[model samples]
Target: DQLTDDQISEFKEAFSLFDKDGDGCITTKELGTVMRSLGQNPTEAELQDMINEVDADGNGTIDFPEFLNLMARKMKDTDSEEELKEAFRVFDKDQNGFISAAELRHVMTNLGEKLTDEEVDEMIREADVDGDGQINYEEFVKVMMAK
Candidate 1:
């Protein structure tokens, strides 16, 4: 959990839209739409999985405070900004200002991580915002912002 204050502020602002009605708590449905906004329309199962993973207290919803906690934990696990940016660049194999699932999988394979097809698909399904079956620069930025 090591985000610069500035980065945290930016993240709060970016996630504001997900707080529909300006309520601090985001329901599973709200999170689904947030994901959808980025073009990644998650199935109910996928959305539930996310909720289960991050929503403590069995609340089945996320508040700003809870989301912040999640962010903090992820920051601790994230790479340095420079390193992350470089990796993101390399993963953007098509140089299309976004990284596709296939591209990410290829890069991982090259790195000898050996991700399964299902894993690659799941990652993409989770990240792709435009529903175009790929990630765009903006969507990628949001994902990185969590880091």
Candidate 2:
């Protein structure tokens, strides 16, 4: 299921916090690494805590699907949807009903981080199930699971 505009925006903001390096996407390893750099990384013990905090679906990892849901919750809990459109517009780059590495790089780079082209290619190939050279929202969200 697609998230609402408000939910998507909130998700973007929350993702931004952990998206250390601002790469527009995150892997579990990257998440851990960013956490470490921020000096607020999650420990083995905190993994469960994070899961509880972020993963309402009981998934083992904090993927995009789980994250958007959490973003919905964050909105419900906090009643805020700040900068919602700006974030979604980036993810929805190309405006082709999907997200691609180009879009990801654009968002990440604009956010003060740079991603290697190789890294972008790798991420797309890993997530693009149809080998279509880009990731639809569904494919994109699935990769976000990172469990």
Candidate 3:
């Protein structure tokens, strides 16, 4: 099989997170909440476009296949190396070649984004390696490249 049972089950779990109501579909609100939690603040237009791209049902909801398509397609889609560096640089307010929870706090505070304490912790945990509690350039790049 092209897709393994491992990844298939993983996708099901991911879809379940988005499908808060267990209705077999994901709404924009759930997607947005998950998106923001991941440190990505998609505008209304961008979010709509994301859904419409695979939204064949035209009901403004995302079915399991569409959500699966998103994950699989995104695996091959990545941003540039330079863009990754740029984002890391932006996050490195202290210019120490590393990003920490404290740095993220600054970005959220000054940038005027809605980042809860737990969300910031999740972002750091998502990228943190070696359990050293900081995001180095490579760690940052991994997170960026995954997108």
Candidate 4:
């Protein structure tokens, strides 16, 4: 799934907080400043690595799109329950709050492993306790947390 309105609002708020100069991007200086605001004192090397990670397009700054992607990845890596829910939301395409087999198939294919439709069904079968032929949030959470 793509970002909802609320998620977009949250990303805009964060971007605004970090884009102190209103330049439509966050430079290394701004990243360090935001880290400080969040009570994190990242080392120079750490900050540089962060910039390298998010500075796509070779711009040396994180544009809003890049920042949003970085934020999503960070949420996934944080291992928080809420973060996991958000990650699930990302894959719950069609915005029905469930991950259908087609959605899973698309994601897997995009990840470079083209799953057969039967394989997709089998994967969902392992988690679809109610046999609804799709994965609800609870089922997704159960499967993800199990890993």
Candidate 5:
């Protein structure tokens, strides 16, 4: 499964948050720290299991891409609705629970994709169920799941 650019950006931010030492990779130690910060207290075996699941390069650490893949796998495995909400929050940008056209455009461009003004308008029109000129979570999920 391929993630949209907005989802990729969210994953990047999440990885950065866990990469506490400013390193490009997350060590097992850093993973534990992040889990703790989230109020999660995983057993040592649980921590090792997580690392093992996504340690694609077998380097005992997870780089950005690996982290992204790991997140994708986890999302696919469980609580997809929650994951979708998290992804939506990234593009919402303002924590307002609505994705504005500008927010959509910015994320699209950041992904190295360009959209014409009309195209952007059409996209909003398609997804703005309440005709509010923005996408709320319900509308956003409908549009995405329709894909």
Candidate 6:
């Protein structure tokens, strides 16, 4: 699932709060209110632009299910940065801010998976953004993002 149960519940609570009138959907005006409450002060023109871009049903308002999908996408975009950082932590055995081929091999092998030296080199080559023969954290993030 793109969203966890906890995240879904949080979104549900926010959606319910946004639907202050107990309507099944949120009008552009309602969204504007929520935006201001959340500290965003967009112009009237920008609010309508937001509604138009997100109104997949081509309706005048955003329904509950549509909001869930939108939040799911937002969560997926944010989750990757955190998840990839955790991966890098596992491979950065020396805390040297980079993943050498040897470190990658050791970490993966320590998990009981056999990795050939050639295969390790292949991964390093794939993730080494500057042909530096090592996978720095920035290069690793970019590689994971592409995947």
Pairs that clash in candidate 2 = 63-144, 63-145, 64-144
lDDT of 3 by residue, 1-147 (tens): 167888889999989988878999887777788889899998888888877877877889999988887787775454355567788898999999889898987887788886888989998999997678889999887887687
**TM-score between model 6 and native:** 0.76
User: Residue 106 error for model 6, in Å?
Assistant: 1.1
Clashing pairs in 6: none
What does the lDDT come to for candidate 6? Answer: 0.86
Q: Order the numbered candidates by lDDT, best leading.
A: 5, 4, 6, 3, 1, 2
Once superposed on the true structure, which residue ranges of model 6 sit more than 4 Å away at CA? 2-9, 116-122, 142-147
The residue-by-residue lDDT of candidate 4 on 22-131, one tens digit each, is 99988888889988998899888888888888888887888898989888877766758778777787778788999999999987787798988789999999989899
lDDT, candidate 2, 1-147, per-residue tens: 456787577777877777666755444655677678868767766655765566555545566667776666666655433343344466776787877788878887888878899987887899899998987866765776666
Clash pairs for candidate 1: 1-76, 38-129, 38-130, 39-129, 39-130, 39-131, 40-129
Comparing 3 with 6 on TM-score, the higher-scoring candidate is 6
Q: Which should have the higher lDDT, number 2 or number 3?
A: 3
Whole-model Cα lDDT per candidate? 0.78, 0.69, 0.83, 0.86, 0.87, 0.86
Task: Estimate candidate 3's alpha-carbon lDDT, on a 0 to 1 scale.
Answer: 0.83
Model 4 error, position 140 (Å): 13
Models 1 onward score TM values of: 0.48, 0.40, 0.45, 0.50, 0.48, 0.76
Candidate 5: worst-modelled 10 consecutive residues by lDDT: 73-82
Any runs in candidate 3 off by more than 4 Å, and if so which?
Answer: 76-147
40, model 5: CA deviation in Å? 2.9
